[PDB]
Amino acid sequence: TCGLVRIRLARFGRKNSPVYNIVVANSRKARDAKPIEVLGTYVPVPSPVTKRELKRGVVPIKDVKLDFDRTKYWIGVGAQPSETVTKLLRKAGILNDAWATSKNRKVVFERMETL
Amino acid sequence: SAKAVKFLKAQRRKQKNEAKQATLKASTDKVDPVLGRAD
RNA sequence: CAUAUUAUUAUCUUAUUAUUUAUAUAAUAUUUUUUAAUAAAUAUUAUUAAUUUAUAUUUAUUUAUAUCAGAAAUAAUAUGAAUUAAUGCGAAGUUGAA
RNA sequence: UAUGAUGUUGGUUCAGAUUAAGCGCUAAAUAAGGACAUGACACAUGCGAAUCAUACGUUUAUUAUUGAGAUAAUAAAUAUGUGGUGUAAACGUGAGUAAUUUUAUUAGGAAUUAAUGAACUAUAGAAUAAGCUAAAUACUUAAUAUUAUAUAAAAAUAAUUUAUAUAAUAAAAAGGAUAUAUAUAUAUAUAUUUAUCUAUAGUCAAGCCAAUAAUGGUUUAGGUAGUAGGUUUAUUAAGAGUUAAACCUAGCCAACGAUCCAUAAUCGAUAAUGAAAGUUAGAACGAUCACGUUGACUCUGAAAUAUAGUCAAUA
Ligand SMILES: [Mg+2]
Ligand SMILES: [Mg+2]
Ligand SMILES: [Mg+2]
Ligand SMILES: [Mg+2]
Ligand SMILES: [Mg+2]
Ligand SMILES: [Mg+2]
Ligand SMILES: [Mg+2]
Ligand SMILES: [Mg+2]
Ligand SMILES: [Mg+2]
Ligand SMILES: [Mg+2]
Ligand SMILES: [Mg+2]
Ligand SMILES: [Mg+2]
Ligand SMILES: [Mg+2]
Ligand SMILES: [Mg+2]
Ligand SMILES: [Mg+2]
Ligand SMILES: [Mg+2]
Beta-bridge mates of residue A19: A12
The alpha carbon of A12 and the centre of ligand 11 are apart by a number of angstroms equal to 30
The CA–CA distances, whole Å, from A2 to A6, A63, A82, A85, A88 equal 7, 27, 9, 13, 18
Q: Calculate how far, in angstroms, residue A45's C-alpha sits from the geometric centre of ligand 12.
A: 31
Quick check: B24 CB within 7 A of strand C?
A: no
Task: For strand C, give the nucleotides within 7 A of a protein CB.
Answer: 9-12, 64-67
Q: Quick one: which of A2, A38, A3, A44 has its CA closest to A23?
A: A38
Residues 6+ apart with CB under 8 A from A100: A90
Angle between helices A68-77 and A83-92 (to 10 degrees): 130
Q: Return the closest nucleotide (C1') to the Cα of B10.
A: D225
Query: To the nearest 10°, the Cα dihedral for A94, A40, A114, A101?
Result: 30
Integer distance in angstroms from CA A20 to C1' D188?
Answer: 57
User: How far is C-alpha B5 from the chain's CA centre?
Assistant: 24
> What is the amino acid identity at position A72?
K
Q: Are A39 and A7 in contact (CB under 8 A)?
A: yes
Question: What does chain A come to in residues?
Answer: 115
Going from the Cα of B13 to the center of ligand 8, the distance in angstroms, rounded, reads 17
Closest CA to A74 of A39, A101, A26, A33: A39
What SS3 state is found at B24? helix
- Nucleotide in closest CA–C1' contact with A29: D89
Method by which this entry was solved: cryo-EM
Q: How many CB atoms lie within 10 A of CB A85?
A: 25
**Resolution for this PDB entry, in angstroms:** 3.8
